[PDB]
Write an enzyme that holds these catalytic residues in place. Sequence first.
Site, short mmCIF file in Angstrom:
data_model
loop_
_atom_site.label_atom_id
_atom_site.label_comp_id
_atom_site.label_asym_id
_atom_site.label_seq_id
_atom_site.Cartn_x
_atom_site.Cartn_y
_atom_site.Cartn_z
N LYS A 144 -11.55 1.42 -19.14
CA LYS A 144 -12.14 2.74 -18.89
C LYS A 144 -11.49 3.82 -19.76
CE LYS A 144 -13.28 5.70 -14.93
NZ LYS A 144 -13.59 5.62 -13.48
N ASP A 184 -7.92 13.56 -6.10
CA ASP A 184 -8.02 12.12 -6.39
C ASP A 184 -6.78 11.57 -7.05
OD1 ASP A 184 -8.76 9.48 -7.15
OD2 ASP A 184 -10.84 10.06 -7.49
N1 LIG Z 1 -1.82 1.75 1.43
C1 LIG Z 1 -1.60 2.22 0.20
N2 LIG Z 1 -0.54 3.00 -0.05
C2 LIG Z 1 -0.27 3.42 -1.26
N3 LIG Z 1 -0.95 3.17 -2.36
C3 LIG Z 1 -2.03 2.38 -2.10
C4 LIG Z 1 -2.42 1.89 -0.90
N4 LIG Z 1 -3.59 1.13 -1.02
C5 LIG Z 1 -3.86 1.19 -2.29
N5 LIG Z 1 -2.95 1.93 -3.01
C6 LIG Z 1 -2.88 2.24 -4.43
O1 LIG Z 1 -4.07 2.84 -4.87
C7 LIG Z 1 -4.10 2.68 -6.26
C8 LIG Z 1 -5.55 2.35 -6.54
O2 LIG Z 1 -6.34 3.47 -6.29
P1 LIG Z 1 -7.90 3.41 -6.33
O3 LIG Z 1 -8.41 4.74 -5.93
O4 LIG Z 1 -8.39 2.22 -5.60
O5 LIG Z 1 -7.90 3.23 -7.97
P2 LIG Z 1 -8.72 3.83 -9.23
O6 LIG Z 1 -7.81 4.89 -9.73
O7 LIG Z 1 -8.78 2.69 -10.13
O8 LIG Z 1 -10.07 4.15 -8.67
C9 LIG Z 1 -3.05 1.58 -6.61
O9 LIG Z 1 -1.88 2.22 -7.19
C10 LIG Z 1 -2.73 1.00 -5.24
O10 LIG Z 1 -1.38 0.58 -5.11
MG LIG Z 2 -11.06 6.45 -8.43
#
Ligand SMILES: Nc1ncnc2c1ncn2[C@@H]1O[C@H](COP(=O)(O)OP(=O)(O)O)[C@@H](O)[C@H]1O
Ligand SMILES: [Mg+2]
Length: 382
Positions: A70, A198
């Site tokens: 991306k 975000d």
């Molecule tokens: N319970 C949690 N606590 C902290 N970080 C989390 C948790 N669940 C997921 N994450 C983190 O969220 C991040 C992914 O975010 P997401 O919004 O799914 O990603 P993107 O930025 O790709 O859309 C990773 O760093 C993952 O470790």
């Molecule tokens: Mg995202």
Amino acid sequence: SKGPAVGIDLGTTYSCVGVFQHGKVEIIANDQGNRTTPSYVAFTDTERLIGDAAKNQVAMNPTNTVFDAKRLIGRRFDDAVVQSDMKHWPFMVVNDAGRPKVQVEYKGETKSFYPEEVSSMVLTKMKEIAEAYLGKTVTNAVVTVPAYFNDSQRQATKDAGTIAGLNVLRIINEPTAAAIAYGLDKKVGAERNVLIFDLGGGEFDVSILTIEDGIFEVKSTAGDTHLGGEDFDNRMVNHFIAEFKRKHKKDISENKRAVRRLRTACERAKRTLSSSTQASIEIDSLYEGIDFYTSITRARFEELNADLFRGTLDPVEKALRDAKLDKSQIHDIVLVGGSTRIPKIQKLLQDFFNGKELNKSINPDEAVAYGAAVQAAILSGD
Ligand SMILES: Nc1ncnc2c1ncn2[C@@H]1O[C@H](COP(=O)(O)OP(=O)(O)O)[C@@H](O)[C@H]1O
Ligand SMILES: [Mg+2]
């Protein structure tokens, strides 16, 4: 016009897919049972791995495990963002007519793909996950994209869909999708200001939308393209490398395999710390033959990342500044991104907004896919 359209969030680190099945949006879990799947693709001698299976073998196959596509999609090889990022990727990025192409090795044969081809593979996996759950073919979908994506980046994404065999009904912005997820798009006969915070796996995006008549207006944005969950994992890693060195008198720093395994353990511990006060790190044969059995406390975690957590508020302060608004003018604050699940981040946000209630009833990591699924349904009928 047959089979409900799906809502797909194609993120830089994790992707998600949901479907408005009669009344509600159900977010579809994958074969491994997860609600989000890494946007990872890997190439071996015998197969092409997508999602969890790809991410789960990265430490072994770094040069042939692709991620961060991306950050390339719709861009020119010659732009500074590409040039800078390239210097920290394990995989090869080559130039073809001024276009970046990820060079990999599949079955001994050397290959290379355009970013949009890497993404379409992730899209095929989501579509599979969907079709699996529904028991029918999924053709129509709404895919999301960052608000700052220009026309090239948006076309590259649409194309990724087409290649994956998807009919992209519409491409909408991620923050807008999050807002729709909470029904903040309904006409209240007034102007409303919403702040999308975000914090995902690798980027930090702050957006202030203004909604009136059900029409969205991105008034301002801010954030950091290199600030996210992985930065927190890394701080823990540096912390354990030093502790292992203390207890064992040997530095594992330069062993690319040990470090990736530790990193995998840390990200898993970090997730636990969001719900518990401490977690255990048990890694058999970490360095050479020594097992690394230990633990971290939520208190220590926040401490290791204090500076990064506080810095998070500067981009917010700037977003208000540019939108020419004051804290008090924000009607709703929506939390998006798996990293917003961290208790200390939520605290810092409320404190800054003097106690205001944060919208977080929908998993922040599933919010974008949730909004896209509602959107897709309305753009269909049922
Ligand atoms: N319970 C949690 N606590 C902290 N970080 C989390 C948790 N669940 C997921 N994450 C983190 O969220 C991040 C992914 O975010 P997401 O919004 O799914 O990603 P993107 O930025 O790709 O859309 C990773 O760093 C993952 O470790
Ligand atoms: Mg995202």
